[PDB]
Design a protein around this ligand. Structure first.
Ligand SMILES: [Mg+2]
Ligand SMILES: [Mg+2]
Lengths: 342, 342
């Protein structure tokens, strides 16, 4: 039969085990290949789809089911170019043209489904769905076989337009599979370019309560930014940026050997929501790890912006995590853990 | 001047920053080379030296100083064979013999110092010291240049005897450097062999309150054991072993792809004190990580021995830690953290 994973709570969904195995997505793997040139796009797409879901289908009242209605083959077809051989393709036909401004580009890069279930007489019933559609900003391609990479820059306006076109087709198709009564949230994502140190971002969503017409769109403004910031990639808040810089300076030279400090800040508009930081250093003893971990927690509380969740992973040179330091936010909240040897 | 790292507390020592840098050991690095054929010996030696220290020099009343009195060069000399060129060597002279039962073996493999300080008029003063001496069980060596590895098996009796001989020399030498009034704990360790999946163990200690004579020895019995257990390497408690096996079985097949589960159990005599477990699996999405992490916490609470600290690191296939699950012990205590993307 089915059992849940996890307990009922206000932060995460319970998931599903069926017949002794986690009930994996019917499209498992498709996102890896669709994002091969920048896997951070997969990670931010998925993370954002889950937060959008949490805002519409409460973790307290829905169980999360990995998407079952759209399988890998179907998503692969939809992500292909339309042709007489692939009539369901959402991307434009190959007009044969090699010029970046004349070709029909790939507008649609990834699609994921998350299903939200309610319990009915010991059985799960589909009660909500979130669909993400990831749209290219740059579409990379080759003029020749193992040859050089070119790109078509898709304007924000065109991306938005083609996203709405794709959303309407996806909604029509999904409605045939799930029926007319399930609320469906469709969330539009902009893929980061291949050289980006952060994944892409969600820019809008719509909620279809019934039918196939697309109603309003609600614009969204959650974005991630690399740390430390640079002249070309500034944070929305300079004070947060200088705070990070202070933390980095305070940590970097703890040992004779310099420690690398990088991270991401998540913003809603211009307001910092959280920090994720990774420190990488060379440790040569367990007591060095204990001391550094204490000092990182001190430096974080002193110098990093307060009142927000901060997670700091402390890795050795080989990438093995030796400790971590965190606060959920509020105040007096840092926590540490060292993954020591017996 | 000096500042501490960390806050005053009952679980860890505060450490020392001097002139903007952590005050590293004067023998930093020596343990890496002394344990090259099994680095788990370094890790368990250091971890155990810290726990022995905590039992004698309270974390609430001493600051930890990385060993300053014995430098790398001196430890290297002491760990060498005695000769007219190296009169301070603690290991026997090279009698030139190639037969494993005729050669003088290397008895002494590693030495580490930890210093414990009290504050006096804004200055730190040496108030205690722990010295570990690691003794071989098997001593590996070559009869020829880039040639084959042989070993001398050193009996438990001989190891113990030679350990006491080495301890007395180390005590005499250290007393000249630190004076006659500082309590010195000398802790004897047995190196694990080169193929061991666990580091070695502390077998005895003595406390020198003054002078150079070695008093009693107190036998100790903390040991680590690999998980899952095997016919050749059983846990001291079969019920703990079968409990681990149950946990492993319950986790292993969560995904279509099998998950590897290994670990260590720390025992005092025959009584389990704690578990460290590492799970390694292939994740393809952030929702898979959330669900697995919940389920690991459930399985741990259901099936693993209760009333002890358990730490479970959950790694992806590339060794990157994706989440972890822990309880300090007692009851209703599991905690989880997912290192998710924004
Ligand atoms: Mg320095
Ligand atoms: Mg299976």
């Amino acid at each position: 039969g089915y059992q849940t994973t996890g307990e009922n709570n206000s932060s995460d969904y319970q998931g599903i085990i069926e017949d002794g195995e986690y009930k994996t997505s019917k499209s498992r793997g498709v996102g890896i290949s669709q994002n091969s040139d920048n896997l951070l796009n997969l990670k931010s797409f998925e993370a954002g789809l889950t937060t959008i879901s949490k805002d519409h289908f409460s973790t307290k009242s829905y169980i999360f089911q990995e998407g079952q209605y759209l399988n890998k083959a179907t998503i692969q077809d939809w992500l292909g170019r339309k042709s007489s051989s692939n009539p369901e393709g959402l991307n434009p036909s190959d007009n044969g043209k090699k010029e970046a401004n004349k070709r029909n580009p790939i507008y649609v890069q990834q699609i994921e489904e998350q299903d939200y279930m309610k319990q009915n007489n010991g059985k799960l019933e589909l009660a909500g769905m979130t669909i993400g559609i990831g749209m290219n900003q740059k579409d990379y391609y080759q003029k020749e076989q193992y040859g050089a990479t070119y790109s078509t820059t898709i304007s924000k306006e065109k991306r938005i337009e083609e996203g709405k076109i794709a959303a309407k087709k996806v909604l029509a198709r999904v409605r045939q599979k799930v029926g007319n009564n399930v609320p469906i949230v469709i969330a539009m994502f902009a893929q980061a370019p291949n050289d980006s140190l952060v994944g892409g971002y969600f820019y809008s969503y719509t909620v279809s309560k019934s039918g196939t017409d697309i109603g309003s769109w609600t614009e969204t403004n959650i974005k991630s930014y690399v740390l430390p910031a640079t002249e070309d990639n500034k944070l929305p808040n300079d004070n947060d940026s200088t705070s990070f810089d202070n933390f980095q300076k305070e940590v970097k030279n703890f040992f004779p050997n310099i420690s690398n400090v990088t991270g991401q800040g998540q913003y809603k508009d211009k307001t910092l929501q959280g920090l994720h930081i990774t420190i990488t250093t060379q440790f040569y003893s367990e007591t060095e790890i204990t001391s550094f971990t204490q000092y990182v927690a001190q430096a974080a509380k002193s110098y990093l912006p307060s009142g927000i969740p901060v997670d700091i992973k402390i890795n050795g040179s080989d990438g093995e995590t030796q400790s971590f330091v965190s606060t959920t936010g509020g105040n007096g909240g840092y926590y540490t853990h060292v993954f020591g040897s017996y």
